[PDB]
Amino acid sequence: MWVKILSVVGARPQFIKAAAVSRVLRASPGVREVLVHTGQHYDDNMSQVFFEELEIPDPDYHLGIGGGTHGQNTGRMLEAIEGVLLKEKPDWVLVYGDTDSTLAGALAAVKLHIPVAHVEAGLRSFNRRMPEEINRILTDHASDLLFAPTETAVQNLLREGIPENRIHLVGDVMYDAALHYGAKAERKSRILERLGLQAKGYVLATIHRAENTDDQERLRVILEALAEVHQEVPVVFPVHPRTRKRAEAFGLGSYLEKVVALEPVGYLDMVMLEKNARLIVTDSGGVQKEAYFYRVPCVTVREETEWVELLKAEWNYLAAPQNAKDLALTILHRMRTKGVEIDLYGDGRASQKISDFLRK
Amino acid sequence: MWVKILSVVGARPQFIKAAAVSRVLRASPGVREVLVHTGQHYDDNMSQVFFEELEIPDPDYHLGIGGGTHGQNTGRMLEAIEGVLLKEKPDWVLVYGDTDSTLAGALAAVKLHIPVAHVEAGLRSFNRRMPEEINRILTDHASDLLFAPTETAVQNLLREGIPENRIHLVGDVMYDAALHYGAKAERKSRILERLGLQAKGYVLATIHRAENTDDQERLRVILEALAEVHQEVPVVFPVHPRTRKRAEAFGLGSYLEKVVALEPVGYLDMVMLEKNARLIVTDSGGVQKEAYFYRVPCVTVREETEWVELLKAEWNYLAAPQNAKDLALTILHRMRTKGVEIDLYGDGRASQKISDFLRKVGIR
Ligand SMILES: [Cl-]
Ligand SMILES: [Cl-]
Ligand SMILES: [Cl-]
Ligand SMILES: [Cl-]
């Protein structure tokens, strides 16, 4: 009708962010939306339940690309995305996060003189070996509008010579989504019932990174710690399939009967879990932020984390799997902590502010 | 034991820079060179001549890509190059200048953790609507090693957050190439013989650009002026084929009979003309640089140039083609001027520097 805003997405978090943006857009008449998924129409990365439960729109296009090298995936995505852009001639192109899809969308649009906005801009790990570091840098420098989630992000962009007037501090739209899904789980998740658990009466653990799941001592130290912690507090562990088959491969599948081990759980139930736990123990970077979003203290069993500002506001604590005694104690300590009451990633209406800056 | 150095080239200037680099590398031990052309293997005699005359190495690969959109060309180049990198496993990829080929080469390499060097880094037009400005920005950011041609390019790179330890001021490789092709012309070219001219005894003119060629007022001005200059000093005018069409159709064909008008000349003959000219008149960016390289005063018949530094150093001069008598006058004035004796684009050893670094042998 009056403005076309086309979203490119090719990973689950990008769909989640695009849907949070789209909740705001869909309430203004005369925004027409187009959703372009770079991947396979019925990719098994995702499920009926991911779409229904997390309220993800049906893409208008599926480009069918993935499973290649960075060159094959990115090259094909650049051609195919360009084609859709030429066909749809949208006013705005929104790209999200820092995958190959992000970069394809931006490079496709900028050569066509179609304005590109990068949702989640300015994040730097300062290690160009990560494909995602290259993706975010190049997306940032190709985009017209840079929607940063933090002040560090903003400063990262300025230090790189991007003009201030292309940079907008809007917060992290994954916080908005955490709140939306948070409310929804309270309304619908029953996983507390079926497990027979009490809000603020359990510890939740996820472990699925290499640095911990491969090495055998580490996975001892980790599961030996969770074992001992189960004694004081019910520990709930939804085990990445891959982390299960690594433990059954040092026979360690005995340190998993003391804890309520579970087979990976529905997305809403997992939110329920996260937001009602007294502590979350993990090596996932995503769960570290979800912890902060729901104001549940976090221990990070990793020897390194990426979200240093959660550490600095004492919502997250670094505890490297050395031995079980040392680790179970620091788990127990942190379980009775909290962090500073500061908003780190916006106020939960990043979507609003993005939308306002566009429909301008 | 060797270093393997793979060049990605897609336009003529890149081939020329690459071949500049390859002339230095061939004298060195334990170097393997791979040349990847992203375009087509051409059989014709024209292209054969370019490779022969300008001493361009025979590419190892021709990926056969071009002729589509930005996304098509770039995305296909990205995949085909990566395919080549996955087979050859070079220690370095060199990319050159600012075409889609440049950018595809860099993006291919960085995601495979193959170090990339951008020959000709840091140039900025500050206009992101230009596709080539996007290419150089993202290339420079994708790159491990930035071979900048000028101090201005260095500051451009520093201002965008790029660490000093990745930036090397080495000069313009095309300067090294101009010197080599200049020597070759002096050796081989008989064009001055044939035209019965003498060094410093003519003016060379080349008009290429649409804005001049496709406009009666502007081409009238230029041809009227060259014909007037030709009275004082012979004017040699290799006329673009398109340029001639327009002239005849506009009814200015007679003014071409009034200067030494030629059909387009060989690459080396053209080098010879430029370097032995008393003055050059042009609207070509390349030619303006070559005038400076050969230390011949230049006049740019255009409302602006890329190369402001040549204006500042008084090697080049803007004379917009508004008035035939004015452009004549300007030409005859500038023809006995020179610029400041200073290097702007290196000392003609940019190649050596580049080579020295990639071989981990240190820059001199
Ligand atoms: Cl992402
Ligand atoms: Cl094109
Ligand atoms: Cl080039
Ligand atoms: Cl790298």
Residue numbers in the entry:
A (entry chain A): 1 to 360
B (entry chain B): 1 to 364
What text does the study give?
The focus of this investigation is on the ORF WP_011172736, which we demonstrate encodes for a 2-epimerase. Whereas the sugar 2-epimerases that function on UDP-GlcNAc have been the focus of past biochemical and structural analyses, this is the first detailed investigation of a 2-epimerase that specifically utilizes UDP-2,3-diacetamido-2,3-dideoxy-d-glucuronic acid as its substrate.
The first structure determined in this investigation was that of the apoenzyme crystallized at pH 9.0 (structure 1). The crystals of the protein belonged to the P21 space group with two subunits in the asymmetric unit. The model was refined at 2.3 Å resolution with an overall R-factor of 20.1%. The two subunits superimpose with an RMSD of 0.6 Å. Each subunit adopts a bilobal architecture with domain 1 defined by Met 1 to Val 170 and domain 2 formed by Gly 171 to Gly 346. The architecture of domain 1 is dominated by a seven-stranded parallel β-sheet flanked on either side by a total of six α-helices. The subunit:subunit interface is primarily formed by three α-helices defined by His 70 to Glu 88, Thr 99 to Lys 111, and Pro 131 to Ala 142 in subunit A running antiparallel to the same α-helices in subunit B. As shown in Figure 4B, the interface is fairly hydrophobic in nature with Leu 78, Leu 103, Leu 107, Val 110, and Leu 138 projecting inward.
